[PDB]
Amino acid sequence: LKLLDNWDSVTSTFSKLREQLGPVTQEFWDNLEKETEGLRQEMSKDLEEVKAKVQPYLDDFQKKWQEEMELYRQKVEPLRAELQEGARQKLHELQEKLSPLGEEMRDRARAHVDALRTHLAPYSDELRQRLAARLEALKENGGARLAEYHAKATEHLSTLSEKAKPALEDLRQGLLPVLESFKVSFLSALEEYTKKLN
Amino acid sequence: LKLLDNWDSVTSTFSKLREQLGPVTQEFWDNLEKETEGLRQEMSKDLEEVKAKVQPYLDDFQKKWQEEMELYRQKVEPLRAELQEGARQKLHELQEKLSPLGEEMRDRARAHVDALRTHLAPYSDELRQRLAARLEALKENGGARLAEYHAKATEHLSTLSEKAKPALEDLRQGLLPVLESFKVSFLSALEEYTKKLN
Ligand SMILES: CCCCCCCC/C=C\CCCCCCCC(=O)OC[C@H](COP(=O)(O)OCC[N+](C)(C)C)OC(=O)CCCCCCC/C=C\CCCCCCCC
Ligand SMILES: CCCCCCCC/C=C\CCCCCCCC(=O)OC[C@H](COP(=O)(O)OCC[N+](C)(C)C)OC(=O)CCCCCCC/C=C\CCCCCCCC
Ligand SMILES: CCCCCCCC/C=C\CCCCCCCC(=O)OC[C@H](COP(=O)(O)OCC[N+](C)(C)C)OC(=O)CCCCCCC/C=C\CCCCCCCC
Ligand SMILES: CCCCCCCC/C=C\CCCCCCCC(=O)OC[C@H](COP(=O)(O)OCC[N+](C)(C)C)OC(=O)CCCCCCC/C=C\CCCCCCCC
Ligand SMILES: CCCCCCCC/C=C\CCCCCCCC(=O)OC[C@H](COP(=O)(O)OCC[N+](C)(C)C)OC(=O)CCCCCCC/C=C\CCCCCCCC
Ligand SMILES: CCCCCCCC/C=C\CCCCCCCC(=O)OC[C@H](COP(=O)(O)OCC[N+](C)(C)C)OC(=O)CCCCCCC/C=C\CCCCCCCC
Ligand SMILES: CCCCCCCC/C=C\CCCCCCCC(=O)OC[C@H](COP(=O)(O)OCC[N+](C)(C)C)OC(=O)CCCCCCC/C=C\CCCCCCCC
Ligand SMILES: CCCCCCCC/C=C\CCCCCCCC(=O)OC[C@H](COP(=O)(O)OCC[N+](C)(C)C)OC(=O)CCCCCCC/C=C\CCCCCCCC
Ligand SMILES: CCCCCCCC/C=C\CCCCCCCC(=O)OC[C@H](COP(=O)(O)OCC[N+](C)(C)C)OC(=O)CCCCCCC/C=C\CCCCCCCC
Ligand SMILES: CCCCCCCC/C=C\CCCCCCCC(=O)OC[C@H](COP(=O)(O)OC[C@H](N)C(=O)O)OC(=O)CCCCCCC/C=C\CCCCCCCC
Ligand SMILES: CCCCCCCC/C=C\CCCCCCCC(=O)OC[C@H](COP(=O)(O)OC[C@H](N)C(=O)O)OC(=O)CCCCCCC/C=C\CCCCCCCC
């Protein structure tokens, strides 16, 4: 309601801002004119300075690039050749190493896997009997536990009857007057709050 | 009142739970004993068979492992020799490359750096002139910037004071009845808060 009075001061604030938006911004533009003029005194020389330097720079760089490229060509080629022969020697080494070791590894695998074929096979079979006996134990006690659980579930359901019936009715018998009392407190609160929030 | 009866049902449940857990832990343990006894008997054969068989298992594996290690060491010697002799050539030939190609690198680096010296020296010197021009403009423009900024700041301070006092006093003057009316509503609303929760 009184916001009009407060906002009126905001309008005055806008006016004060507009006063600055004029000469201050205009002055800023005048400063910008100095900035642009300055840049036209800096960049004018800078750009030419760059051009007059980039040319010999790229030229000197080209010289260095040439030195590097030529030097690298006279290095990469012979080195690659030597590395190739060295790699071929390494390859031959690898071949002459991985071949006997490969055959050996295959026999190693034979001696290991065939061993496993005669180690894990009876092991799994033994485990099968062991697991079977264990399964029977789990089924014996499990089947009993199922009966026990069913009995306990029955006891639990029976002990739940005294909760889902009398206790639930008791809760309902409590909820009725409670909700009523809550309603009285809520209704009054609603009116009371509305009266002060109007 | 509600909590008293509700919690009563809780204790009337904990008791039943305790009366249930009693035989439950026993029945569970009885079944657990049957299982664990069987597991023990089973584990007796399990561990014994595993240990009795682990002996020839390890013996078989170690036997082959001996061959694996022996043949490995047997071949490791000539293989290491191939690596050593081969590397001797590879490294020696490379050392014979790092020498001339290294000298060439240094010689190329000489021209590389020396050409850089004859370029970077005047480049940085001329850059000093460029930077001088930049700094000159930055100083001259800066002097204006600061002068204008001071002017703009003064203009800002003028409108600032026109708001820090008149507008602020308007706000503060309004804050008086506003805060008071708010206090009136808050203090009165506080009645409901207490008369509804106690
Ligand atoms: C319609 C347009 C109208 C114009 C209205 C503009 C609205 C903003 C209005 C008022 C707030 C300004 C108050 C700031 C006063 C400080 C000025 C100052 O002196 O400042 C520089 C100093 C640091 O200098 P120092 O190292 O020498 O001092 C530290 C000392 N030690 C190193 C030396 C030992 O810093 C400090 O005081 C730190 C101050 C903390 C900054 C508070 C700013 C609060 C305002 C807005 C929040 C902005 C969030 C940003 C969102 C992005 C928007 C684009
Ligand atoms: C001698 C002179 C010296 C230099 C002086 C300054 C001059 C100004 C120029 C460059 C420097 C400013 C850089 C600011 C970024 C620019 C963004 C921008 O303006 O972009 C747009 C451009 C153009 O695209 P277009 O389609 O319009 O033009 C079509 C192509 N037309 C032009 C070629 C024919 O886009 C591009 O140039 C594409 C680039 C996007 C790159 C993507 C991949 C980034 C990967 C890795 C970076 C991280 C490295 C980190 C590792 C180091 C850790 C220490
Ligand atoms: C010392 C001097 C020499 C140094 C060597 C020069 C280094 C540079 C050379 C090669 C770079 C290799 C790295 C690339 C990585 C990606 C591998 C990849 O893409 O992997 C996934 C594929 C998927 O299968 P696919 O059916 O789609 O591909 C069929 C392959 N296709 C189409 C080619 C027939 O799998 C494959 O390519 C299967 C890969 C299995 C490779 C088996 C042969 C291994 C040979 C020798 C053993 C060496 C022992 C010595 C080690 C010592 C080193 C110091
Ligand atoms: C101690 C006495 C208790 C014995 C049972 C009596 C009532 C169960 C009471 C309490 C259990 C605790 C809460 C379990 C949560 C289930 C809520 C429900 O209602 O979930 C229905 C939705 C249906 O969704 P759907 O149609 O897409 O899936 C159909 C399923 N299909 C694709 C997967 C195979 O399923 C789901 O959320 C996923 C779960 C579906 C599980 C169904 C297993 C029913 C097993 C036995 C019922 C027969 C009891 C009779 C035995 C004689 C007793 C004297
Ligand atoms: C029909 C509806 C029935 C619902 C289903 C049954 C759920 C079981 C529910 C309730 C149990 C019976 C109620 C007994 C009530 C009182 C228990 C008690 O006296 O409470 C207090 C204790 C100790 O007080 P505090 O240390 O907390 O306080 C620190 C002390 N102060 C506060 C001074 C700083 O609290 C403790 O002992 C906290 C327990 C310790 C954490 C045990 C973690 C168990 C994990 C998994 C369960 C599976 C076990 C089987 C797996 C075994 C494999 C070998
Ligand atoms: C007939 C049928 C045959 C089957 C029979 C075999 C089944 C039983 C299985 C295994 C044999 C159990 C061994 C007997 C019990 C003793 C357990 C124990 O205590 O033995 C002691 C070891 C050593 O102790 P230490 O190393 O400290 O001492 C070494 C420190 N020295 C350097 C300082 C001196 O302890 C250990 O072996 C404990 C290591 C286990 C915990 C590893 C932690 C893994 C953590 C993270 C993995 C990431 C999961 C994330 C998801 C990724 C999935 C891919
Ligand atoms: C314009 C172009 C001109 C062309 C002309 C060429 C001639 C110039 C010649 C050589 C300059 C290349 C220098 C390479 C970088 C050396 C880094 C370094 O100082 O290294 C040795 C140090 C000493 O060890 P420290 O533990 O005592 O020192 C660390 C402990 N503190 C800090 C406490 C003292 O650190 C180590 O050895 C630790 C290992 C980490 C360093 C790995 C070396 C990485 C090399 C190059 C990176 C760039 C690859 C890209 C280039 C490829 C282009 C195709
Ligand atoms: C588009 C792509 C192409 C662009 C081309 C750009 C053209 C520029 C071309 C070539 C570079 C010329 C300019 C740089 C050469 C100046 C060398 C110099 O005179 O350096 C002086 C320094 C300081 O003197 P000090 O040795 O007594 O103090 C060291 C004291 N302490 C240990 C505490 C760190 O010496 C040191 O740092 C040396 C001792 C410490 C070792 C540092 C590692 C050096 C190796 C590799 C890293 C390279 C850094 C060079 C990057 C330059 C960027 C401009
Ligand atoms: C029947 C229906 C049932 C109703 C029941 C439910 C209601 C919830 C109940 C209670 C919650 C509030 C209780 C806490 C009372 C303390 C309030 C207070 O005075 O707390 C101030 C503290 C800050 O410490 P200090 O001032 O004492 O120490 C100053 C430093 N020394 C120590 C050197 C002096 O606060 C802090 O730590 C944290 C907050 C910091 C805030 C500072 C003020 C910022 C101002 C404006 C920004 C906007 C705030 C608006 C929030 C949005 C709301 C939607
Ligand atoms: C973290 C490390 C990252 C580096 C990883 C390197 C390993 C690479 C893996 C395998 C070898 C690959 C070897 C590849 C050699 C081929 C180099 C070449 O000519 O590449 C052509 C490309 C072409 O790019 P374009 O953008 O023109 O084309 C793409 C096209 N539009 C599209 O949509 O697909 O340009 C490029 O990719 C970029 C320019 C490269 C210039 C060459 C520059 C080479 C410079 C120097 C030589 C190398 C150093 C040797 C040192 C030994 C001597 C002392
Ligand atoms: C209608 C009338 C309006 C006029 C009202 C006038 C009332 C003025 C009264 C009080 C204003 C208080 C103005 C305080 C200004 C700064 C005051 C200041 O420097 O305080 C110093 C403290 C000290 O910090 P330290 O870290 O040094 O130590 C902590 C200290 N020991 C402790 O226990 O707290 O730091 C603090 O606690 C600072 C937290 C300040 C909280 C504000 C934090 C900023 C909160 C909000 C601003 C965000 C605005 C977002 C708007 C954008 C979208 C619209």
Swiss-Prot record, chains A, B:
Q: Provide a Gene Ontology MF annotation, just one.
A: heat shock protein binding
Q: Which residues are glycosylated?
A: K196
Q: What is the effect of changing T25I?
A: Confirmed at protein level
Q: Would I find Lipid metabolism among this entry's keywords?
A: yes
Could you give one GO CC term from the UniProt record?
Answer: plasma membrane
Q: Please indicate if the UniProt record lists Lipoprotein as a keyword.
A: yes
Compartments, as annotated in UniProt: Secreted
Q: What is the recorded post-translational modification? A: Glycosylated.
Q: Which GO BP terms sit in this record? A: acylglycerol homeostasis; adrenal gland development; amyloid-beta formation; blood vessel endothelial cell migration; cellular response to lipoprotein particle stimulus; cholesterol biosynthetic process; cholesterol efflux; cholesterol homeostasis
Tissue specificity here reads:
Major protein of plasma HDL, also found in chylomicrons. Synthesized in the liver and small intestine. The oxidized form at Met-43 and Met-69 is increased in individuals with increased risk for coronary artery disease, such as in carrier of the eNOSa/b genotype and exposure to cigarette smoking. It is also present in increased levels in aortic lesions relative to native ApoA-I and increased levels are seen with increasing severity of disease.
Keywords attached to this Swiss-Prot or TrEMBL record, sorted alphabetically, are:
Amyloid, Amyloidosis, Atherosclerosis, Cholesterol metabolism, Disease variant, Glycation, Glycoprotein, HDL, Lipid metabolism, Lipid transport, Lipoprotein, Neuropathy, Oxidation, Palmitate, Phosphoprotein, Repeat, Secreted, Signal, Steroid metabolism, Sterol metabolism, Transport
Q: Which residues carry this modification: Methionine sulfoxide?
A: M43, M69
Question: Residues annotated as region 10 X approximate tandem repeats?
Answer: 1-198
**In UniProt terms, what is the effect of altering R130C?**
In Milano; correlated with decreased HDL levels and moderate increase in triglycerides; allows the formation of disulfide-linked homodimers via the introduced cysteine; assembles properly in HDL; alters protein structure; has no tendency to form fibrils and aggregates
The sequence repeats extend over 1-22, 23-44, 45-55, 56-77, 78-99, 100-121, 122-143, 144-165, 166-176, 177-198
Function recorded in the entry: Participates in the reverse transport of cholesterol from tissues to the liver for excretion by promoting cholesterol efflux from tissues and by acting as a cofactor for the lecithin cholesterol acyltransferase (LCAT). As part of the SPAP complex, activates spermatozoa motility.
Q: How does it assemble?
A: Homodimer. Interacts with NAXE and CLU. Component of a sperm activating protein complex (SPAP), consisting of APOA1, an immunoglobulin heavy chain, an immunoglobulin light chain and albumin. Interacts with NDRG1. Interacts with SCGB3A2. Interacts with NAXE and YJEFN3.
What disease involvement is noted?
Answer: Hypoalphalipoproteinemia, primary, 2: An autosomal recessive disorder of lipoprotein metabolism, biochemically characterized by severe apoA-I deficiency and severely reduced serum high-density lipoprotein cholesterol (HDL-C). Affected individuals have undetectable serum levels of apoA-I, and develop xanthomas and corneal opacities. The disease is generally associated with atherosclerosis and markedly increased cardiovascular risk.
Q: Which family does it belong to?
A: Belongs to the apolipoprotein A1/A4/E family.
What is this protein called in UniProt?
Apolipoprotein A-I
Question: What organism is recorded for this protein?
Answer: Homo sapiens (Human)
What gene is behind this protein? APOA1
